[PDB]
């Protein structure tokens, strides 16, 4: 999801109030969400494997 | 703290003219004095005495919910601190009355941040009080010695049971009204809008809460003096079941008179409430007669708790007489909102809580510490208290009879009453 | 520009009595504590406040400090008008501007 | 001698006030009687049964006197039913509201001062008729042509005849205030919207016997200067009242209309608080 | 449990009678009809006492006499094991502090402080509830 | 009939404070002679008028206010549209950079970088600029309410004022492109968020992964 | 965790500011939280200056001196404590904080001092959000800085002994 | 000063004065006898 979002999300600055964007203001939040969730899920899986096997 | 506020008020009230206080400051002073004295001293001292001596009286090892007990204590403490910490605001503390009437408490009038802290602190303290009442009811119902029936338990225990029931009736509706007022002040919520019946809605809700409160802070102290009299008269308590029935009747009646605080509005049904208060005046007299019969023909010795109980008797008799006089609507039409009402409720409040609290402290200090308080210091304390109280609150009847309303920061030399 | 109504509550530091052109005073904007711009001008209080460490200066008492970590007054500039009616400076500051150091103000 | 038994109640200037004072004195006598009885019992049992002398086994362990119990629970019911009866009688007498009054006053209370209206005058003698209503209101507040308006420098004085039905219609602009004339021995709250709150904001006095100046206070909690909303009431004779109204119908202030009939122009029972 | 239920039933009877009397006497004889505030308050006060008295009756009608309900009872009758009573705990003061944080955030309109107070309340209540049920650390 | 309806409305609620001739009671109110309709519009619309002072709801509604304004002017005007209504979008400017420079030089010392509130000495404070409209901003900087300096139209031109209005209306309503605005202030909320979120989560992970005794 | 909070929370939005210019200012202050205690010290220190022959010692010299004194006293604590207690042995086992009440109270006092200095740096934000006066906040910090740490010391000492009991 | 859990023994509970009947046992007869005199 991080790869695809980074490749195909509309990222350029479009801030105004003629055509209120709301799409440009989600780019960095989505980057952080996908990146952090991916690596944190991998971490939780590793911790669970250590604790149970 | 509350007594310091009252001393500032008296010092300003002497000597016509504004010597050192301002109008806003005097208003904050009587507001916070009433608030502290009524909700941060008396209602929690009730549960202090309860936690001290109720399980020992029913023969239990503990209360029903010992962690809910501590939660109630800390909720009381932090709510009181939140409500008091409005003095450090540039606008000051709450300066409407202790009753916080209908349109004066909105955000147009009274726009400061002290009233908000006042409201939220009262809500927190009320939650604590509700939890305490639940705890006490459950402790009396479940935990009890294997031979002690309900008509063998002490009158103090009976009175605490009844007071807890009244607490559970009264405090949630005050919480609801305060949340409504906060919604108004923080969202423009039209709830106490005078274009609706918003002016009288607040008064009805508040007094429905507020009269059961003044009975909540009286019955446990009736119970205290009922425990103290037989010990120092060397006799049984006169009319045990009669005192129980009188307590129950007072409790039942206390939730049906609330609008005798609204005679001068022209919006209440006068005969209903007048008759209800005249009715509630009777079981108190029955209780007085039982207390007299307890001492009658005994072997009286006057130590400090007995002395304080007799002082309670005298003071509360005078206060109750002035109150039953106050219950007549045509008389209230003149003496309402004056210093006559102040003298009345100070007589009753002082007589019950101050005198019975001192009597109970002197009674149960050995049981809680293993030491005895000094007796000469106690007699000096009692006589100072008696003389000071009757010197400060007797002339106020006349003071309010000639026109002098309450909550006045200032008056003129050409007026009377100097 | 001070209202003409007061113009009698000014205290006029010992060597700077003729530094004002009527109701115009023109003090410096650099604070004497650590050099931040002292910009917050309260007009009905006649007070100058710096938003860095919250020093306060009395614009009616030669910008003397009355609160905060500052200790010295703000330097005042002499002003006047020219023959064309424009406001000009009537000389230089009589003391260094800004924070102090080992040598002097 | 009854002045000391009234405990400070002023002498009324109205028949309803005098009836109220009668009821008050009777009730105070009854209360003092009961209090003396109870205090005497307490004093007796404290002075004589205190006799824990040098001898004692134990006094006696009695705890029930059922007939005495029931007698002492019966007596207070009667002693309060009598008071309830007289209370209902007097409090119905104080709230008559006869359909035809003779002077009608519109009392307006705002934050820390008063305003008076002179809405209608109709003497039963046929000596004077006047309608002072006004569509100056182009909305629950009443507006009139002859209006006395209070200022922090001038105490508002209300002028009234001596011997007529007077009616008061009370309205508040912002918050609750209080209308108390201590010589009326009566009081009433001044509400923002009395009709939306189911409050009767109209009350009448039959007549005012004495003439002179009397004081009035605010008896609510309305904010900062709650203690500084005093007003005065001048009771004059009907002919001087008609002269006053005729002198004010032509443009003239309250002080001028009062000076034109040989009376003090400013309030004589109160003063403007100079600390305001 | 007969006397407790009887007490609550007496209170219920009085409250119901007062409620209906006030409701009728304000429907008639009053300025704008029913008062609509004291009526509601009295009705639900009756409801409160009714709920409590009904629960007490229903637990009493399916019960046999306890030693505290029984005169002529001996202390040897109550011998045995009472329930669990919590010794020392520090969670109540944390719950109080969390509620105070939320209340200050509600007094001074600060949504972030309200949110923080609510999160603290959840956490401290969970701490209180799980205190005597957590097991040993599983390593 | 504007001058007439204005005086009657003024004489009822305003003479008590200022005076019969609008000259100022020595204790109650200011003079009000030199002020125009702009001060009457601002002070009344923001609810700061008739008082015993934050913003509140106005009592007079858009017609009484205009009548009182015309009356006080008859003894700085508001800007109107060619149809007679009050200007709302016409007051915005096109030079956002100039507006921002002027705001940071003249206005940001008291409110904020982005129009949040500010603390003043001994009580008083500067409010948030979010609930104000364009005409209210214009009249505010034209009349200079309490403790705020009065910006004459000769020292700050109308076009510069319009640029400042555009800049503040953009700075109050634009979405933040970096995530949750932590209050608009600097690193104090950021350090709070650090200690309450990041360090708490890290320490909880350490408690979960490691042992204790 | 760092990625999540670097994506979801906005920090240092430099565009809402402008470029630095010596004539403009804002109510903004308060460096990053690890430098806030120096800012708070500079805010609450009283203005004590010295003027002698053609020279001047301004007030921030006090701030610099206190900063350097902290920077010196931090690395010297092991040697100071071993000199005071007279304990020169080797140690591989740790101590529980409740068993060393004097050191625990010293550390609690130091943390209280640091927290007072850090709260004094956000004077204006605190006064704006929680309705307190600016002068009041300044004086509150100035008095707390001297009266709070010993109170915390006393309480910490008694608390450790209670845990031991 | 009561112990933790408040009790090391309990007396027989026959009335509302159990401590009185415990400390003065020569008085229970004279208490039940002359109680309803009035
Ligand atoms: C409004 C204020 C709400 C007041 C809260 C309710 C109080 C009710 C107390 C009645 C009985 C007391 C009791 O049983 O003591 C248990 C215990 C006291 O411990 P104890 O004295 O040692 O005695 C233990 C017993 O022996 C036996 O202890 P136990 O372990 O058997 O516990 C029995 C049972 C307890 O039985 C119950 O009382 C369950 C009833 C659930 C009430 C839900 C409240 C809804 C909130 C209103 C929203 C507005 O506990 C549970 O199984 C789970 C309880 C879950 C409580 C969660 C409350 C939600 C708070 C979060 C608010 C956020 C949402 C809004 C935004 O108290 C609690 O567990 C409740 C704490 C309340 C915190 C105050 C909230 C502020
Ligand atoms: C505004 C807030 C800002 C948010 C900050 C960031 C939030 C992120 C979460 C915080 C840290 C992440 C934790 C990662 C570990 C997760 C793995 C796990 O659950 O293992 C269970 C783990 C037990 O592992 P163990 O090593 O076998 O220990 C067993 C012992 O018996 C241990 O028994 P014990 O006797 O030592 O006592 C147990 C103790 C142990 O729990 C803790 O220590 C966690 C708190 C440490 C944070 C640092 C506190 C510093 C404050 C000063 O917990 C408690 O005493 C009760 C507290 C209630 C915790 C759950 C309430 C969540 C409310 C959410 C709203 O206990 C937990 O950590 C549960 C807490 C987290 C709940 C799961 C996530 C829920 C998310 C909320 C849903 C919306
Ligand atoms: C240690 C290193 C600290 C970093 C760890 C923080 C993560 C939390 C730990 C945790 O949740 O796991 C459970 C963890 C379980 O430990 P364990 O692995 O089973 O056993 C390891 C040892 O055997 C356990 O040995 P222990 O039980 O003998 O010692 C534990 C505790 C027991 O020692 C004590 O007696 C502490 C008593 C000091 C309280 C004084 C506060 C006075 C406040 C004034 C108001 C009074 C009213 O000693 C301390 O750690 C406290 C020293 C720091 C106190 C500084 C107070 C700052 C005052 C700021 C006022 C402004 O609990 C702990 O032992 C550590 C709790 C540490 C609490 C720190 C609180 C932060 C204070 C700053 C407040 C900031 C201002 C707002
Ligand atoms: C513990 C506190 C307490 C107690 C016990 C009482 C007891 C009573 N109160 Fe009071 N009251 C207050 C606290 C209390 N009050 C407070 C705080 C206010 C105003 C709060 C505020 O506005 O800020 C107030 C206000 C108040 C008013 C409204 C006054 C006004 O605002 O204008 C009225 C009127 O109905 C009233 C009546 C009564 C009656 C009839 C009793 C009865 O309980 C008393 C009857 C008891 C007696 C002792 C009778 C003695 C019996 C006998 C011995 C037989 C005698 C025979 C006869 C004379 C009948 N009270
Ligand atoms: C239990 C309740 C209670 C108690 C105990 C008191 C106690 C006292 N009260 Fe109060 N009072 C009320 C409840 C109470 N009051 C209420 C409800 C109102 C109406 C509120 C309203 O209008 O909103 C009121 C109003 C009120 C007024 C009218 C104010 C106004 O309306 O204008 C007056 C003035 O005469 C007064 C006087 C006193 C006095 C002299 C005492 C004395 O008994 C107390 C004197 C005690 C002391 C002086 C304490 C000793 C002080 C120290 C030794 C200083 C030490 C300092 C520290 C430790 C911090 N009270
Ligand atoms: C502290 C000072 C003295 C003011 C306290 C407020 C005062 C009016 C009432 C306190 C009540 C007290 C005296 C009695 C006891 C009450 C009880 C013990 C608890 C109350 C204590 C309170 C609620 C704790 C808060 C204290 C406060 C000073 C801590 C500051 C925290 C920092 C400044 C938050 C920073 C911050 C800010 C400022 C944001 O605007 C923001 C916006 C959006 C997201 C995040 C943030 C954010 O993190
Ligand atoms: C020996 C044994 C018995 C015990 C040993 C310990 C003993 C008690 C030591 C004696 C005490 C004494 C020696 C210390 C006096 C205090 C100090 C060292 C005097 C001056 C220190 C100071 C000027 C140097 C520190 C660096 C800074 C503060 C200089 C100025 C300064 C600079 C240079 C910054 O870059 C800066 C950047 C951002 C914020 C602030 C500053 C700032 O203040
Ligand atoms: C006595 C209470 C009071 C009331 C009522 C009142 N004012 Fe004011 N007014 C003041 C005070 C005091 C100020 C000084 C500035 C301030 O306090 O904000 C002021 C300021 C003003 C100003 C701005 C002064 C200036 O220098 O720019 C205007 C315009 C004004 N008032 C008009 C009105 C209007 C319109 C009303 C609506 C009837 C009104 N006043 C009612 C007290 C009052
Ligand atoms: C610290 C001095 C100060 C300066 C400089 C200053 N302001 Fe103000 N401003 C205030 C204060 C104080 C108020 C509150 C006025 C009141 O309460 O009556 C205010 C009020 C306002 C309001 C109205 C807020 C509302 O709720 O309606 C606006 C808009 C405004 N200012 C904009 C500006 C602009 C634009 C500038 C730059 C030209 C500026 N301010 C400069 C202090 C200042
Ligand atoms: S820089 Fe102005 S106060 Fe420190
Ligand atoms: Cu009452
Ligand atoms: Cu009243
Ligand atoms: Cu008033």
From Swiss-Prot, chain C:
Subcellular location(s) of the protein: Cell membrane
Binding site for [2Fe-2S] cluster: 31, 33, 50, 53
Disulfide bonds: 36-52
Domain Rieske: 1-88
Stated family: Belongs to the Rieske iron-sulfur protein family.
More about this protein: Was identified as a high-confidence drug target.
Function text: Iron-sulfur subunit of the cytochrome bc1 complex, an essential component of the respiratory electron transport chain required for ATP synthesis. The bc1 complex catalyzes the oxidation of menaquinol and the reduction of cytochrome c in the respiratory chain. The bc1 complex operates through a Q-cycle mechanism that couples electron transfer to generation of the proton gradient that drives ATP synthesis.
Subunit structure: The cytochrome bc1 complex is composed of a cytochrome b (QcrB), the Rieske iron-sulfur protein (QcrA) and a diheme cytochrome c (QcrC) subunit.
Protein known as: Cytochrome bc1 complex Rieske iron-sulfur subunit
Native source organism of the sequence: Mycobacterium tuberculosis (strain ATCC 25618 / H37Rv)
Source organism phylogeny: Bacteria, Bacillati, Actinomycetota, Actinomycetes, Mycobacteriales
Full protein segment contained here: 323 to 427 of 429
Curated annotation (Swiss-Prot), chain F:
Major site of localization recorded for this protein: membrane
Function: Cytochrome b subunit of the cytochrome bc1 complex, an essential component of the respiratory electron transport chain required for ATP synthesis. The bc1 complex catalyzes the oxidation of ubiquinol and the reduction of cytochrome c in the respiratory chain. The bc1 complex operates through a Q-cycle mechanism that couples electron transfer to generation of the proton gradient that drives ATP synthesis.
Gene designation: qcrC
Domain Cytochrome c, chain residue ranges per copy: 1-75, 94-172
Localization: Cell membrane
Protein name stated in the entry: Cytochrome bc1 complex cytochrome c subunit
Residues of the full protein shown: 60 to 280 of 280
Taxonomic placement: Bacteria, Bacillati, Actinomycetota, Actinomycetes, Mycobacteriales
Keyword annotations of the record: Cell membrane, Electron transport, Heme, Iron, Membrane, Metal-binding, Repeat, Respiratory chain, Translocase, Transmembrane, Transmembrane helix, Transport
EC number: 7.1.1.8
Subunit note: The cytochrome bc1 complex is composed of a cytochrome b (QcrB), the Rieske iron-sulfur protein (QcrA) and a diheme cytochrome c (QcrC) subunit.
Curated annotation (Swiss-Prot), chain G:
Effect of residue 38 to A: Confers resistance to Q203 and IPA. Remains susceptible to LPZS
Residue range from the parent sequence: 276 to 440 of 549
Membrane-traversing stretches: 60-80, 106-126, 143-163
UniProt miscellaneous comment: Was identified as a high-confidence drug target.
Family: Belongs to the cytochrome b family.
Function recorded in the entry: Cytochrome b subunit of the cytochrome bc1 complex, an essential component of the respiratory electron transport chain required for ATP synthesis. The bc1 complex catalyzes the oxidation of ubiquinol and the reduction of cytochrome c in the respiratory chain. The bc1 complex operates through a Q-cycle mechanism that couples electron transfer to generation of the proton gradient that drives ATP synthesis. The cytochrome b subunit contains two ubiquinol reactive sites: the oxidation (QP) site and the reduction (QN) site.
Annotated source species: Mycobacterium tuberculosis (strain ATCC 25618 / H37Rv)
Protein name, per record: Cytochrome bc1 complex cytochrome b subunit
Subcellular location: Cell membrane
Subunit description: The cytochrome bc1 complex is composed of a cytochrome b (QcrB), the Rieske iron-sulfur protein (QcrA) and a diheme cytochrome c (QcrC) subunit.
């Amino acid at each position: 999801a991080l790869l695809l979002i980074f490749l195909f999300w509309p990222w350029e600055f479009k801030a105004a109030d003629g055509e209120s964007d709301f799409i440009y203001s989600l780019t960095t939040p989505l980057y952080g969400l996908t990146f952090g969730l991916s690596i944190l899920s991998i971490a939780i899986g590793a911790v669970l494997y250590q604790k149970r096997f | 703290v509350g007594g310091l506020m009252a001393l500032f008020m008296r010092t300003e009230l002497a000597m016509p003219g504004l010597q050192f206080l301002s109008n806003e400051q005097f208003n904050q002073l009587f507001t916070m004095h009433g608030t502290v004295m009524l909700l941060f001293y008396a209602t929690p001292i009730v549960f202090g005495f309860a936690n001290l001596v109720l399980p020992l009286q029913i023969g239990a090892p503990d209360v029903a919910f010992p962690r809910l007990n501590a939660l109630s204590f800390w909720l009381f403490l932090f709510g009181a601190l939140i409500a008091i910490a409005g003095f450090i605001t540039p606008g000051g503390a709450a300066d409407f009355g202790w009753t916080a009437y209908s349109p004066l408490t909105d955000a147009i009038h009274s726009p400061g941040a002290g009233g908000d802290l006042w409201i939220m602190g009262l809500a927190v303290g009320g939650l604590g009080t509700i939890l305490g009442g639940v705890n006490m009811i459950t402790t009396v119902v479940c935990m009890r010695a294997p031979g002690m029936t309900m008509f063998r338990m002490p009158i103090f225990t009976w009175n605490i049971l009844v007071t807890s029931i009244l607490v559970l009736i009264a405090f949630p509706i005050l919480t609801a009204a305060l949340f409504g007022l906060a919604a108004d002040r923080h969202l423009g919520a039209h709830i106490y809008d005078p274009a609706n019946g918003g002016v009288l809605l607040w008064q009805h809700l508040f007094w429905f809460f507020g009269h059961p409160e003044v009975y909540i802070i009286a019955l446990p102290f009736f119970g205290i003096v009922s425990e103290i009299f037989p010990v120092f008269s060397r006799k049984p308590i006169f009319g045990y079941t009669t005192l129980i029935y009188a307590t129950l009747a007072i409790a039942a009646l206390s939730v049906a008179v609330w609008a005798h605080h609204m005679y001068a509005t022209g919006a209440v049904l006068l005969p209903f409430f007048s008759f209800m208060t005249f009715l509630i005046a009777v079981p108190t007299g029955i209780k007085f007669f039982n207390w007299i019969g307890t001492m009658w023909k005994g072997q009286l010795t006057f130590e400090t708790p007995m002395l304080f109980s007799v002082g309670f008797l005298i003071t509360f008799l005078l206060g109750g007489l002035s109150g039953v006089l106050l219950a007549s609507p045509p008389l209230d039409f003149h003496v309402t909102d004056s210093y006559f009402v102040i003298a009345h409720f100070h007589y009753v409040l002082f007589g019950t809580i101050v005198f019975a609290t001192y009597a109970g402290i002197y009674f149960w200090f050995p049981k809680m510490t293993g030491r005895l308080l000094d007796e000469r210091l106690g007699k000096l304390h009692f006589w100072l208290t008696f003389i000071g109280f009757h010197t400060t609150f007797l002339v106020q009847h006349w003071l309010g009879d000639e026109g002098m309303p309450r909550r006045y920061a200032d008056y003129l030399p050409t007026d009377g009453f100097t | 520009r001070i209202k003409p109504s007061d113009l009698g509550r000014v205290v006029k530091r010992k060597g700077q009595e003729s530094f004002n052109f009527g109701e115009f005073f023109a003090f410096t904007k650099v604070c004497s504590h650590l050099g931040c711009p002292s910009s917050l001008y309260e007009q009905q209080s006649y007070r100058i406040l710096c938003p860095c460490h919250q020093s306060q200066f009395d614009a009616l008492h030669f910008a003397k400090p009355i609160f905060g970590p500052a200790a010295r007054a703000l330097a005042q500039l002499p002003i006047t008008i020219d023959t064309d009616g424009y406001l000009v400076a009537n000389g230089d500051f009589v003391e260094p501007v800004g924070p102090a150091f080992w040598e002097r103000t | 001698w009854s002045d000391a038994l009234a405990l400070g109640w002023p002498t009324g200037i109205t028949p309803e006030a005098k009836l109220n004072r009668e009821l008050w004195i009777g009730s105070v006598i009854a209360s003092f009687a009961v209090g003396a009885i109870v205090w005497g019992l307490i004093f007796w049992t404290s002075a004589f049964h205190r006799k824990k002398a040098t001898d004692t086994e134990l006094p006696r362990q009695f705890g029930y006197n059922m007939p005495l119990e029931l007698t002492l629970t019966v007596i207070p019911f009667l002693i309060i039913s009598v008071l309830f009866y007289f209370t209902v009688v007097v409090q119905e007498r104080m709230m008559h509201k006869d359909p035809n009054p003779e002077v009608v006053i519109d009392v307006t209370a705002f934050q820390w001062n008063w305003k008076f209206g002179y809405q209608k005058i109709a003497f039963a003698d046929g000596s004077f008729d006047y309608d002072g209503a006004d569509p100056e209101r182009k909305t629950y507040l009443n507006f009139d042509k002859i209006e006395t308006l209070g200022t922090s420098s001038e105490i508002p004085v209300l002028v009234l005849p001596a011997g007529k039905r007077i009616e008061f219609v009370l309205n508040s602009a912002d918050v609750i205030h209080g209308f108390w004339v201590p010589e009326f021995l009566f009081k009433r709250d001044v509400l923002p919207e009395p009709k939306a709150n189911n409050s009767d904001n109209v009350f009448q006095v039959s007549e005012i016997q004495q003439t002179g100046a009397f004081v009035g206070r605010c008896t609510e909690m309305c904010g900062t200067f709650h203690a500084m909303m005093n007003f005065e009431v001048r009771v004059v004779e009907p002919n001087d009242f008609k002269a006053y109204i005729d002198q004010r119908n032509a443009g003239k202030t309250n002080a001028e209309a009062l000076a034109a009939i040989n009376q003090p122009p400013l309030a004589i029972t109160t003063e403007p608080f100079e600390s305001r | 449990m007969h006397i407790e239920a009887r007490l609550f039933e007496i209170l219920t009877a009085f409250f119901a009678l007062a409620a209906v009397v006030y409701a009728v006497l304000t429907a008639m004889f009053a300025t704008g009809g029913v008062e609509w505030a004291g009526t509601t308050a009295l009705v639900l006060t009756t409801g409160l006492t009714l709920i409590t008295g009904t629960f007490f009756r229903f637990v009493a009608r399916r019960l046999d006499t306890r030693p505290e309900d029984y005169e002529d009872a001996e202390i040897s009758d109550g011998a045995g094991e009472l329930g669990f009573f919590a010794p020392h705990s520090w969670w109540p003061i944390l719950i109080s502090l969390s509620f105070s944080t939320a209340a200050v955030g509600a007094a001074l309109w600060l949504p972030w402080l309200i949110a923080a107070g609510v999160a603290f309340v959840i956490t401290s209540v969970c701490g209180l509830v799980f205190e005597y049920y957590w097991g040993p650390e599983k390593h | 009939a504007l001058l007439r309806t204005g005086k009657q409305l003024f004489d009822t609620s305003c003479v008590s404070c200022h005076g019969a001739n609008l000259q100022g009671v020595p204790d109650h109110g200011p003079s009000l002679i030199g002020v125009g309709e702009a001060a009457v519009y601002f002070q009344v619309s923001t609810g700061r008028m008739p008082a015993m002072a934050p913003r509140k709801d106005p009592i007079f509604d858009e017609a009484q206010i205009d009548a009182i304004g015309a009356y006080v002017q008859a003894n700085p005007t508001v800007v109107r549209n060619p149809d007679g209504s009050i200007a709302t979008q016409s007051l915005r400017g096109n030079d956002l950079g100039r507006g921002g420079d002027l705001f940071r030089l003249n206005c940001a010392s008291c409110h904020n970088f982005t129009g949040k509130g500010g603390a003043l000495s001994s009580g008083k404070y500067a409010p948030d600029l979010a609930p104000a409209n364009e005409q209210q901003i214009l009249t505010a900087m034209l009349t200079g309410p309490q403790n705020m300096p009065k910006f004459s139209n000769r020292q700050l031109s109308f076009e510069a004022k319009k640029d400042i209005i555009a800049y503040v209306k953009v700075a109050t309503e634009a979405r933040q492109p970096g995530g949750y605005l932590l209050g608009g202030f600097g690193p104090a909320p950021e350090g709070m968020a650090m200690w309450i979120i990041g360090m708490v989560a890290a320490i909880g992970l350490a408690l979960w992964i490691g042992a204790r005794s | 965790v760092l990625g999540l909070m670097g994506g979801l929370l906005q920090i240092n939005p430099i565009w809402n500011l402008g470029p630095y210019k010596p004539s403009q200012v804002s109510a903004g202050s308060q460096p990053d939280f690890y430098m806030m205690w120096t800012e708070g010290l500079a805010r609450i220190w009283p203005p004590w200056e010295f003027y002698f022959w053609h020279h001047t010692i301004p007030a921030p010299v006090w701030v610099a001196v206190i900063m350097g004194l902290v920077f010196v006293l931090l690395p010297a604590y092991p040697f100071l404590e071993k000199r005071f207690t007279g304990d020169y042995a080797h140690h591989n086992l740790l101590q529980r904080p409740r068993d060393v009440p004097v050191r625990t109270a010293i550390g609690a006092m130091a943390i209280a001092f640091y927290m007072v200095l850090t709260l004094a740096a956000m004077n204006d934000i605190i006064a704006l959000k929680f309705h307190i006066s600016l002068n009041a906040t300044t004086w509150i910090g100035r008095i707390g800085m001297v009266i709070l740490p010993p109170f915390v010391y006393f309480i910490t000492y008694r608390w450790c002994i209670g845990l031991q009991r | 000063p009561p112990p933790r859990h408040n009790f090391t023994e309990l007396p027989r509970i026959r009335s509302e004065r159990p401590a009185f009947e415990l400390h003065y046992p020569h008085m229970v007869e004279r208490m039940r006898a002359e109680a309803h005199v009035g």
